[PDB]
Design a protein around this ligand. Structure first.
Ligand SMILES: N=C(N)NCCCC[C@H](N)P(=O)(O)O
Ligand SMILES: [Mg+2]
Ligand SMILES: [Zn+2]
Length: 889
C-alpha cells in the first residue's frame, strides 16, 4: 500500500509537449493509439521512463517508431510501464502505443466507459491512465489532438475538447471527427463523448470583448425536453462571473452533457462539462423542487471551475481544496445571489455542522490540505470542499467586498495559465490585506493554519456590562481538541462578525463590526453602550467553529424574534433545542439505566413555543426560515454533543420534544398548511420551463414540513389532507404524500400510485426510491427487500444504489436496530458493490463514520461488520484504505 506525502513533491524528469490520440470504438473493444511528443526536463537524472497505465492491453509500444521488446527493454505489470533508461532517448523523442480497452464492461465509471448507449470518459483524478499510457499527474501540461471514430448510426454525435477540425466517413458505416485543442491542459481535463445525443443551444455574448459563445446542452433523446433549466443556469453563471468578478469565458463553445451512470455531481473537462443526469435534467412535471436548486448549484460550480481549476491550475493533488473549496465558495456566492432566499446560506451551514463536523471529529479527520494519501479518490470530501469553502469565504468576511475582489483579481492575473498552490492564494489575499489595513507589515501568515490544522475550533464567550460606565465587554476564548494530526493545536485567525441588539426595542446598537480573534483569548470592549445588549455572534456563520454563546434561553428567544441576521436567529433556535435535547436525553438515559418505574421529564420552555408561534403567524416572515424553526437539529449535528450516544434514547428524546411542541401548536400548523396552499401550489407558471420561484418552493417546503408534523401527530382527519395532496401536479407534494402516509393504513395504496407516476422517468423513479427508503415504516426491512426484488435488482447504476440505501441509513430507530441487522445489511451491499465500483462502495460506508460515537453495544456491532468487510479477499484498495483509516488499524 503506497503512501504519497505532500512534502515529497518533485517536478518530473520528463516533459510531454503534445498528445495525438486516435480512439476507435468498436462493438466488443476500443483501440486507443497514442503518440506522445516528449523531452527530457532539467530535473532528469537518467532515470527509467515510468508511465502510468491501468488495465491496458498492449498491442505494441515504440520509441521513435521502433518497437520495444517486453522483458529486455520494458516491463508492464498492469499499473506501471517501466522503460529502462538505457533505451530512453536523451533529447526530444516520440513515445507511441496501441492498447485495447473495454468501455462496455467498465462499471467502475473511471477511464472510458459506456453509460446506457453513451460512451463517456471520466479522468479526474487518475482516470486518464485507464485510457492510455501517461505521466498521469496534473503538472504534466500538454497540447491535445484527438480523433474519435465509431459506428455512425449508434454514435452520430462525437465530442472532445477544443475545435472540431475535421469530420469524415469511414467504410462499413463508421465515421470520425478530429478535435484540436492547442492550449496546454493537464490530462484529467481531457474528455470524449460519443452518442445519439439531442440538444438545446443558445448564443451568449460576453460583457467586455463581446465574444459570441455557443452553448450546447446534450442528453439522450427521451429527456432532451428537461434541458431548458440547465441552459438558463449556464447563462446565469456566466453573467455572475462577469458581474461579480469581471471574468469572461475565453472559448468559442461550451458543451454540457448529461449521463445516467456517474459518480456524484459533474466534471469540469475544458469546454466539455459532463454531469450526473440528476444534476442537469429537470421539468416541473417530473422533478421534485430540490432539482432546481441542485442544477443551479452544479452548473454554476462546473462553470466557475473554468477559472478556478482550468485556467489557474493545481500543481499537485494536495492542493485540491484550492480549486474545490474556492469553486464551492464561488458557487455559494452565485446561488445566494440567484435564489435571494436566506435558506440558501442556512442550508450550507446545516450541511457543514452536521456532515463535515462529524467527519472532523472522526478518525477520518484531516485538514483541508492533507499531508498524505493512498487513494486520491478518497480525498474528495466534505472537509476539502465545504470546510475549504468556509476557509475561502472567511477571506471575503475579513476583507469585505471591494478588497476581496482586488485580492481575487490579483490571484487570477498572476497565476492565469500556470499551476498554483494554496500559498499563492493566501499571498494574493495578503496583498489585499496590506492595502486594506494601510500597513505593509500586516500579513496573513497565521491564516495558513486553516490549511494545515485539522479539527473544528471551539469558540466560547463571557460578557460584562457596566451600567454607570456604559461599557460592554466580550471575553472570547478559542481551543481545538488534539487529534491524530497535531499533538498541539495553535490558535487560528478567527473573524467574528457581531452586532449588539438592544433588548428593549430590538434595534442595532453598533455598526457592522468584525472582531479579529488571533490569540487563544481576547477581550473586546465597547464604550457608549447605553443599555445591556444581547450580543449577536458569528453573523452569517462567520467562521467554521462550534459556537458556545453562553446565553440564557430568554436572550436566545429575544434574538430569534428580533435579531437582523438569519443565521444568528436560526442558531439561537438551534441552541435552545440542543439544551432541551441534552436535558431530556440524560433524563431518559437515567430512567433506562436505573430501570425506573416512574420518572419526570423537563418540559419544553413555554416562551420558546410562544416565540415559534409568533414567527409562524407573522405573515411577513419567510416560509423557508419558518420550516427550519419547527424542525429539530439534524441527528448528525446532535451526535457531536453526546458521548456513547444511545440511538433509541435519542429517538425517544426527539419524540418527546416534537410531541410537546405539537401538543401546543398543531392547530396553528394545520391552519398554516391550509392558508399556504394557494400561493405554494400556484400553477400559473407550471408550463413555463424557465420560470423558477425559490420563494414559492420554500412555501411548498413549509407545507410539506407541517404536513409531516401533523401526520406523525395523527392530527384529526389529517388523512383527508394527505390523500388530496397525493393528487397534486408537483412531485414534491405527491412524494411527500407517500412519506407522511407511512403513519396510516393507506401507505401501500400510495406506494403503488406514486410508483406508477414515477416509473417511466429514470430520475423521478430514483426520487421515488429515496422516498420509500426514507419512509418511517415499522416493516422497512420487508419493504427494502421488495425494492431489491422488484425495482433495483442487479442494477449497477450508482444513482439507483444510493437511492435505495442511503436514506434508509438515516432511520434512527431502524437502521440502528440493536440486533445489528441494519449494519449487516449495509455491509453486504458495500461488499457486493465494491466488486464493480469501489467509489460507490466507499460512499455507502457513510453511516459507519460515527461508529466510535455510539453506545458500547452498537460500537461493537459496527466494528464487527467493518472488520468482516476488511477481511474480504477481493477488497479494493480504495475500500481497504478507507476502512483501515476509519477503524484506526
Ligand atoms: N471522488 C472522486 N475521485 N471523483 C471526483 C472527481 C470529480 C469532481 C469534480 N471536479 P466536481 O468538483 O464535482 O466539479
Ligand atoms: Mg483492460
Ligand atoms: Zn469541483
Amino acid at each position: 500500500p503506497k503512501i504519497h506525502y505532500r512534502k515529497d513533491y518533485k517536478p518530473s524528469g520528463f516533459i510531454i509537449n503534445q498528445v495525438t490520440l486516435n480512439i476507435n470504438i468498436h462493438d466488443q473493444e476500443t483501440i486507443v493509439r497514442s503518440v506522445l511528443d516528449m523531452d527530457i526536463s532539467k530535473h532528469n537524472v537518467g532515470e527509467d521512463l515510468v508511465f502510468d497505465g491501468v488495465g491496458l492491453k498492449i498491442n505494441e509500444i515504440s520509441i521513435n517508431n521502433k518497437k520495444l521488446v517486453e522483458g529486455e527493454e520494458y516491463t508492464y505489470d498492469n499499473e506501471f510501464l517501466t522503460i529502462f533508461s538505457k533505451f530512453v532517448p536523451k533529447s526530444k523523442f516520440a513515445f507511441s502505443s496501441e492498447v485495447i480497452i473495454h468501455p462496455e464492461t467498465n462499471y467502475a465509471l473511471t477511464g472510458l466507459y459506456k453509460s446506457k448507449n453513451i460512451i463517456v470518459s471520466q479522468c479526474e483524478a487518475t482516470g486518464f491512465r485507464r485510457i492510455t499510457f501517461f505521466i498521469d499527474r496534473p503538472d504534466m501540461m500538454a497540447k491535445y489532438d484527438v480523433t474519435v471514430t465509431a459506428d455512425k448510426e449508434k454514435y452520430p454525435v462525437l465530442l472532445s475538447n477544443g475545435d472540431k477540425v475535421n469530420e469524415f466517413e469511414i467504410p462499413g458505416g463508421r465515421h470520425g471527427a478530429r478535435f484540436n485543442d492547442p492550449p496546454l491542459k493537464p490530462c484529467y481535463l481531457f474528455a470524449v463523448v460519443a452518442g445519439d445525443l439531442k440538444h438545446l443551444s443558445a448564443t451568449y455574448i460576453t460583457k467586455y470583448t463581446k465574444k459570441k459563445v455557443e452553448l450546447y446542452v446534450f442528453s439522450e433523446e427521451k429527456y432532451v425536453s428537461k434541458l431548458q433549466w440547465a441552459l438558463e443556469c449556464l447563462k446565469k453563471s456566466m453573467a455572475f462571473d462577469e458581474d461579480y468578478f469581471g471574468l469572461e469565458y475565453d472559448l468559442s463553445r461550451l458543451n454540457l452533457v448529461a449521463v445516467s451512470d456517474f459518480n456524484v455531481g459533474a466534471m469540469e473537462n475544458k469546454g466539455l462539462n459532463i454531469f450526473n443526469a440528476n444534476s442537469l435534467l429537470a421539468s416541473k412535471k417530473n422533478s421534485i423542487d430540490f432539482s432546481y436548486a441542485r442544477i443551479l448549484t452544479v452548473v454554476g460550480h462546473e462553470y466557475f471551475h473554468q477559472y478556478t481549476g482550468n485556467r489557474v491550475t493545481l500543481r499537485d493533488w494536495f492542493q485540491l481544496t484550492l480549486k474545490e473549496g474556492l469553486t464551492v465558495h464561488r458557487e455559494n456566492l452565485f446561488s445566494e445571489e440567484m435564489t435571494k432566499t436566506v435558506t440558501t446560506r442556512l442550508s450550507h451551514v446545516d450541511l457543514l455542522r452536521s456532515v463535515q463536523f462529524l467527519e472532523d471529529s472522526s478518525p477520518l479527520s484531516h485538514p483541508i490540505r492533507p499531508e498524505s494519501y493512498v487513494s486520491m479518490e478518497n480525498f474528495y470530501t466534505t472537509t476539502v470542499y465545504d470546510k475549504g469553502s468556509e476557509v475561502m469565504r472567511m477571506y471575503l468576511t475579513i476583507l469585505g467586498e471591494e478588497y476581496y475582489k482586488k485580492g481575487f483579481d490579483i490571484y487570477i492575473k498572476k497565476n492565469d495559465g500556470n499551476t498554483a498552490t494554496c500559498e499563492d492564494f493566501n499571498y494574493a489575499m495578503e496583498q489585499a490585506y496590506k492595502m486594506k489595513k494601510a500597513d505593509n507589515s500586516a500579513n496573513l501568515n497565521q491564516y495558513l493554519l486553516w490549511f494545515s490544522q485539522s479539527g473544528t475550533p471551539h469558540v466560547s464567550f463571557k460578557y460584562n456590562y457596566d451600567a454607570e460606565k456604559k461599557q460592554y465587554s466580550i471575553h472570547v476564548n478559542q481551543y481545538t481538541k488534539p487529534d491524530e494530526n497535531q499533538k498541539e493545536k495553535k490558535p487560528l485567525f478567527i473573524p467574528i462578525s457581531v452586532g449588539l441588539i438592544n433588548p428593549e426595542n430590538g434595534k442595532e446598537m453598533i455598526s457592522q463590526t468584525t472582531l479579529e480573534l488571533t490569540k487563544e483569548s481576547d477581550t473586546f470592549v465597547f464604550n457608549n453602550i447605553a443599555v445591556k445588549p444581547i450580543p449577536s455572534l458569528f453573523r452569517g456563520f462567520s467562521a467554521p467553529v462550534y459556537i458556545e454563546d453562553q446565553l440564557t434561553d430568554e436572550e436566545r428567544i429575544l434574538l430569534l424574534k428580533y435579531d437582523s441576521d438569519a443565521f444568528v436567529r436560526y442558531n439561537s433556535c438551534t441552541n435552545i433545542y440542543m439544551k432541551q435535547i441534552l436535558m431530556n436525553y440524560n433524563e431518559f438515559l437515567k430512567a433506562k439505566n436505573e430501570k425506573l418505574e416512574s420518572f419526570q421529564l423537563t418540559p419544553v420552555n413555554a416562551q420558546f413555543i410562544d416565540a415559534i408561534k409568533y414567527l409562524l403567524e407573522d405573515p411577513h416572515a419567510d416560509a423557508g426560515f419558518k420550516s427550519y424553526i419547527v424542525s429539530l437539529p439534524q441527528d448528525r449535528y446532535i451526535i457531536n454533543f453526546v458521548s456513547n450516544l444511545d440511538t433509541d434514547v435519542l429517538a425517544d428524546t426527539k419524540e418527546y420534544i416534537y410531541k410537546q411542541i405539537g401538543d401546543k401548536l398543531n392547530d396553528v400548523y394545520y391552519k398554516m398548511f391550509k392558508s399556504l396552499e394557494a400561493k405554494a401550489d400556484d400553477l400559473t407558471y407550471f408550463n413555463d420551463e424557465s420560470h423558477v420561484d425559490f420563494d414559492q418552493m420554500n412555501m411548498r417546503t413549509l407545507r410539506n414540513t407541517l404536513l409531516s408534523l401533523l401526520s406523525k401527530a395523527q392530527y384529526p382527519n389529517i388523512l383527508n389532507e394527505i390523500i388530496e395532496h397525493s393528487k397534486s401536479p408537483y412531485p414534491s407534494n405527491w412524494l411527500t404524500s407517500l412519506s407522511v402516509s407511512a403513519y396510516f393504513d393507506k401507505y401501500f395504496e400510495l406506494y403503488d400510485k406514486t410508483y406508477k407516476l414515477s416509473k417511466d422517468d429514470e430520475l423521478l423513479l430514483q426520487e421515488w426510491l429515496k422516498t420509500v427508503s426514507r419512509s418511517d415504516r415499522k416493516d422497512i426491512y420487508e419493504i427494502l427487500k421488495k425494492l431489491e426484488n422488484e425495482v433495483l435488482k442487479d442494477s449497477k447504476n450508482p444513482n439507483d444504489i444510493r437511492a435505495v440505501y442511503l436514506p434508509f441509513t438515516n432511520n434512527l430507530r431502524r437502521f440502528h436496530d440493536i440486533s445489528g441487522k441494519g449494519y449487516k445489511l449495509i455491509a453486504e451491499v458495500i461488499t457486493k458493490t465494491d466488486k464493480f465500483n469501489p467509489m460507490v462502495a466507499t460512499q455507502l460506508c457513510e453511516p459507519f463514520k460515527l461508529w466510535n460515537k455510539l453506545d458500547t453495544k452498537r460500537q461493537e456491532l459496527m466494528l464487527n461488520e467493518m472488520n468482516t468487510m476488511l477481511q474480504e479477499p477481493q477488497i479494493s484498495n480504495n475500500l481497504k484504505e478507507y476502512l483501515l483509516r476509519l477503524t484506526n488499524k
